[PDB]
Symmetry: D2
Subunit: 461 residues, 4 copies
């Protein structure tokens, strides 16, 4: 008589389970952690609040935490990223989950709250797993007392890490965190190669547009912008790249991309005259990858080529000024998460109007909103890091320290390189790759152990 | 004219070298921007720089920027095959002491370094060191320790040199502070990677004129050089396999679209012939070493390689390949300079029509510099703008003149601050005609940076 | 008002389909340009076209262009899984007879074709055929020969269909002339190649959401479909090997940077398990058949494949893969529509956690259409602009009205003239915003062409 | 005491012979024919005038013809394309060759004349091998009596085939020809993949310029244009493509290139006003690939970005208006086959002037002028076709046939597809590739012999 959940349709659980069984075969690092730690039950007595996209891959993460001894209560960190069959399979296994594809904002907040409250009262949670910092913010702001019991937070993504570092700087962070994002087997795997796989996937599913031969503008060239640019270039798009960071812009040039600004002289003074109208007038697709605010702004949207596609693969939808488009332009739904935005006015639209843009996932994370985000074999790296970060903080028991010792222990850290290498080795073996073992003389020659770590902590890969 | 303090192959190549220098200047906007920015201030007035780095046209622009900012220099190459003789001639013709030519012997290489160190039989009054690989740094510390008493710092170009500096620092044997120029992003992630992408397939074509498309390559290593090298071959249509000891680098190779393999069965290098994956090596048309490690293409691998395979090294030192084994056992037939056929049929003589040979490029020395011209000027612009800034910083710090307590606080191996890395990058991007967008105040506040940068935390890996 | 002459999955999908048709029209400038150019002239007035081709959104734009030009049509799909139900619904809601849904049985497939042929239980007075694969053409010749006496021609979309026409021609059994639409350059070297480049990895992602980067693929065939398929996988970072029986196509694969391998030791398929290269197939994560041939992924290959390999086919017919052997011997577990795990453990049931299975996509039917949406509108633009021109040409020639002696001289399989192929291509280039340069009169004289084209001899291969 | 030659330096012969021995191991189709036909001596009695780039690869072709029984007398078909060590090895083998790198135009014509004449009188030639049509034209216009004895012409390249078809159309072709260009193992190997290998090769040797991130304009997108665009794009150039043929332009778009015209709206009206100055002012490299005349004209040259590189990889230098540049601008030699062209005027230049273009090989074929042309393993295909074509036309013995039989055979033809396939098969095996053999049922199913040919003659690959 398990009822402690809310999903779109529980009858999808058998389908969800079939896809979980396939995903386990694609996630050797994660499944290897189940075998390595199951006898030891290192998460026995852990009670984890989880807030991350309720996909099949998150399903395998959740069941790994449970196989290692944890109880969890789960929600998604985006209104469109849940795969309903994954949420169903998790609920049907007796696990509290509150997530469905197509939540309203109010439902999104309610879902987080159902993880935080059990039977109307704060759950006795002692760990947090977060992706974007929304659950972390709600606990700090609305349930600060619960953080007196919590041993740490493991944060998945760049945007969430920034918010943790803000709190650390301000002295408002109450528990230590692991920056899971900055493991190499996360940031340089998930953020880059994951978006390479899933950006053109989402655009094809949403529009079925030919990309070859067409003009794209990618805003940003960090890890997600690098992966996004490659996703489009390998399809034969002519890709241009915008950046505020000259080092990242240098890499885009060397990678064979023309680097341009939406603005004359690169100066964003807020006027229409600042827009390079010739440039925007040729662009068939714009993709925002920055984690910043309003990098595809109202004047850019006004200048864009008719029938251009607009989408965002950064964590939050405020990269694009969708508010301006809601206020001024008429939205025509093509199908779920695909809207034609008619620039002729707000008062209805001509069904045969040519002057529209196509917006994907209402500006929300497009790879998860219009497709299924990253594939299992990539999320294997990210989620093996999450499990190890959860064990790492849970075994250190920060919440049991006195305040003076807590202050010394409070930090936002990355996992040590030896663990990053262990995850990577399991990923490499999953491809059938064979890593070479150094001889003792060679290890001495370059100053490393035969067992690693193989690089100084300064190394950038 | 009057000035004889140099040794080059052919001083009559100077006009040609000057022509190429004027072109390279147009390809190096960050370096020429520093030249214009600092010429009036002469921040290197009174600097006396010992420099040891490949005497190419690009190094010529570096040398003349240091001189233009007030420095005196004495120069040698850090490799026996990497000098461009017309670049060396142009520098000597400018009145600048340089001891470098393409095709030095080992003894001549050592002699050239000593000629920078000594002027008229006695130690020059050097006070700065610019180095690439640590050979000059090592000679100073071992054979001329008294000279380091007046030297304010070393600016070290490459990964191998940095490793050597960090070991000396850990051992307490490093006598002057250093700047790790290699780990500026506009060096490591530009020169080490994209420079090898441009220049590896360049050198292989010049040396052999072999079609690369459709053939099988084995790249040993997948760090910055191995990454760029693998791409140099893959973009030509080679079927590239990658070897690594680092599972993170190996993961990157898989995700980049390469099969990851080991020359040894199960990756276990026990020194036996039986440990060689003979089936794998018997299919390889080209092997490239990129590791900075020792004996990563060993005798048993050389024995097992496909007939007529090409063997080369693009790491700093030639001991990546066991060329000593090949000198001891196999007959060498020079095809042309820096290209030898190595006949595996025996030591004394060869059949001119023997089919069982390998082709070795540059006798195992850095192949991009030995068989072509190394990295192009527009890439070396980034590396050498960092060098100029590093020289300015350490020279103005004046370590040799500080009290002992201050020396102890500053005796370290550091990178340049990220703000300077970004300033070099910005000039490189402008050189391509790229335009960097300026953050609005609100956007800068949103991501927690200054509008002027730095734009990333020091943890960032790019 | 009272239109019932159709059969689709769900007529209420029509508004959705119309929204997507309006979008597709903006992606199909060559086809809509033909609609605008010819609509006033009504060149297809009196044409009664039997159409058998994948009932996609792209085919909807084709259908409505034929109707806009004056034709009546009766339509079916040429594959049981390729229909987009919202496209079929929009076409039916427009009062156009269409018999098509995703997930037909074979019996329903034949029934749908027969519903186009018969109107109110009697042969429709058809006078034109548009076909993709030859099934409609074969049913007409075998079962309704009297209908062909009134048909002016067949316009055939695809390589396999053209092969069937040329067999009939050589055997003396073809009853009406045909245009080979496939071999326009704006079809064959657009649709067959670039279409599969877009849609193969699309369909694999939708069916499995597998990572492709770093995994091993075997593509059987390197014609136009195999070239486009190989690129679809390689651009994702797969390690792609290619099999071929044609040495010229194999040479192209080598030069394009692929290893060319055979499933059979030394390429010799003697029908035994012993001839299978077990080591090679045991490494393969994905096999794709592209040949138009029979049993190129056979039972012994399926037995040898790596556990959990994906198997699919993008040639026209499912007999490229021996699925019948798999139905006879192994247990099928449906993951979701058009995605099956095939458990090699036995026929009677399976362990839900068995590791020894293959994933078959679309039951071996055309995978890009079965698991995704086939080629994108802007590619199908070229193919379907050729179809419209071919229908106009054969309809206006009026073969069916000729005396028997003249029918014999006119009975042929021809391609469209190069000038029309160029005109389709020009509208496609304009759709991308490309600007084609115009020759000066002196340049046109220098290379021996008219300023307006055609620009190449008919021998030219592009 | 053999002296019937003229080369730069006979002392280079040992070096040339070393490179020929290597090249033989890279040319299995050609060396396989050499071994196959040696017993039969199919070219016994053949006396071949040859005019083709005197490279190491041509050396292996020459010695194959001689090994099969021919006598030859040889010249290069370009003033810059000879490898002097190849010419020396051929001469030192006792084979008449007249060729060196850096001929004058007068010397070029002298060298062809030295193959035509032996001892001051027309040689008793009976076969012609040509690349570009210059020898063919001199024979028809200056030595027509010699054509009465000649059985055929085997012509290497697109430009020469066009000239042969123009002669045939006008009734002036005196002997039959085989169009070697249009074997698939020549056109879609040599013309495309050869330029992919050797174009960026020649630009690097001439300028050592970084190509990644810079802007290129390739004029033409036929086989040479396709290969050239790939040569630059695989280095990271941003490549734009110009074409007059809309089908070729369509391929460029689908291949991921922006298609542009040097002229506004594509209309070349001869005035500066028609130039797209904004476009040409951003171009770092222009490469002409057309076989046409004046496709990089004076007005384009005036408008190119300062310091742009200009080069031609079509057969003749008139693709670029070098005559305009000689008349108006000052040329500064950087090194052989590399000139700075100073747009500041005719009479002298400032050595530090910034307003120059870099011209490679004085506008002559740049892959052969500034590097070594195509590599051996590519030329293997072209030159195996040359040998087969020479055997075919020599055995047909056209010069001996009665007039009505000559009339049936006076044509320009390609080799049969079966031979094209057999050449390709040897190339594939050179890579270690394994071709699959059809079963009898599969051969029957697609309507081919198990031995091939596998494609109809209509097939375009
Ligand atoms: N959708 C996904 O699956 C996915 C995966 C990982 C991360 N993310 C999210 O994507 C975002 C980017 O992540 P990242 O790891 O690439 O961060 P990053 O710091 O590596 O890159 C962001 C880049 O944006 C640039 N940028 C900032 N403001 C800009 C502006 N106005 N114009 C142009 N460029 C600008 C920065 O210079 C930086 O290089 C974050 O929100 C992260 O949480 C999404
Ligand atoms: N030729 C050039 O122009 C040039 C340019 C830059 C650097 N370098 C030199 O190249 C070398 C590599 O430099 P880098 O920056 O790439 O260093 P790096 O540390 O980034 O990469 C070296 C890689 O080699 C791998 N490796 C070590 N031993 C191995 C073995 N036995 N088998 C396989 N892989 C092994 C390591 O795991 C590492 O990832 C250094 O000697 C450096 O100074 C040369
Ligand atoms: N799914 C799609 O959207 C789509 C698009 C166009 C065509 N098609 C179909 O795809 C098939 C191929 O079309 P195509 O235009 O590429 O034909 P093609 O003739 O150009 O190529 C088929 C290739 O298969 C090779 N081949 C034949 N038997 C083989 C074997 N046993 N092993 C290996 N290679 C073998 C042939 O040598 C040939 O090169 C046809 O059925 C065609 O109708 C499908
Ligand atoms: N350098 C080499 O090694 C090499 C190799 C093979 C052929 N070639 C020569 O290269 C030339 C091209 O050969 P190909 O086989 O590619 O010929 P091709 O006919 O396949 O291609 C030439 C292309 O130029 C285009 N073109 C013509 N005039 C143009 C103009 N004004 N603007 C833009 N595009 C224009 C044509 O439309 C055509 O597509 C010929 O001279 C040939 O002899 C050189
Ligand atoms: N498939 C996925 N599952 C969970 N988090 C993700 N982030 C990006 N892709 C994801
Ligand atoms: N290397 C080469 N030898 C002869 N002709 C060629 N044409 C192109 N490259 C050539
Ligand atoms: K997924
Ligand atoms: K260089
Ligand atoms: K579609
Ligand atoms: K060559």
């Amino acid at each position: 008589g398990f009822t402690d959940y809310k999903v779109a349709d529980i009858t999808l659980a058998a389908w969800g389970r079939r896809e979980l069984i396939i995903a386990e075969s694609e996630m050797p690092a994660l499944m290897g952690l189940r075998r390595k730690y199951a006898g030891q039950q290192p998460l026995k007595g852990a009670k984890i609040l989880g807030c991350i996209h309720m996909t099949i891959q998150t399903g395998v993460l959740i069941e790994t935490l449970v196989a290692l001894g944890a109880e969890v209560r789960w929600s998604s960190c985006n209104i469109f990223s849940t795969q309903d069959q994954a949420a169903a399979a998790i609920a049907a296994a007796g696990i509290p989950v509150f997530a469905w594809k197509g939540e309203t904002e109010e439902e999104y907040e309610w879902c987080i709250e159902q993880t935080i409250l059990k039977d109307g009262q704060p759950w006795d949670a002692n760990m947090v797993l977060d992706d974007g910092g929304d659950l972390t913010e709600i606990l700090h702001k609305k349930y600060p007392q619960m953080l007196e019991r919590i041993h740490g937070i493991t944060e998945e993504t760049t945007t969430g890490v920034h918010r943790l570092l803000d709190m650390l700087k301000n002295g408002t962070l109450k528990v230590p965190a692991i920056n899971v994002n900055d493991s190499v087997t996360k940031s340089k795997n998930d953020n880059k190669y994951g978006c390479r796989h899933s950006l053109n996937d989402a655009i094809k599913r949403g529009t079925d547009h030919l990309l070859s031969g067409k003009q794209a503008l990618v805003i940003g060239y960090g890890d997600v912008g690098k992966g996004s640019s490659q996703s489009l270039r390998q399809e034969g798009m002519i890709v241009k790249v915008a950046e505020v960071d000259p080092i990242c812009a240098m890499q885009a040039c060397m990678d064979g991309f023309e680097v341009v600004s939406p603005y004359k002289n690169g100066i964003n003074d807020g006027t229409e005259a600042s827009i390079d109208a010739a440039l925007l007038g040729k662009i068939d697709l714009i993709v925002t990858t920055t984690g910043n605010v309003n990098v595809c702004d109202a004047n850019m949207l006004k200048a864009l080529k008719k029938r251009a596609v607009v989408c965002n693969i950064g964590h939050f939808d405020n990269e694009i000024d969708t508010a301006f488009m809601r206020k001024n332009w008429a939205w025509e739904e093509v199908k779920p998460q695909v809207h034609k935005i008619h620039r002729t006015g707000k008062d209805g639209f001509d069904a045969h109007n040519d002057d529209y843009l196509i917006l994907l996932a209402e500006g929300r994370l497009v790879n998860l909103g219009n497709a299924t985000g990253h594939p299992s074999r990539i999320m294997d790296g990210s989620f093996a890091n999450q499990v190890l970060a959860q064990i790492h903080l849970f075994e250190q028991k920060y919440a049991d320290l006195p305040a003076a010792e807590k202050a010394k222990r409070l930090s936002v850290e990355v996992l040590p390189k030896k663990l990053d290498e262990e995850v990577a080795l399991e990923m490499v073996k999953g491809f059938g790759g064979v890593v070479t073992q150094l001889t003792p003389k060679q290890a001495e020659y370059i100053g490393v152990s035969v067992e690693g770590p193989f690089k100084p902590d300064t190394y950038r890969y």
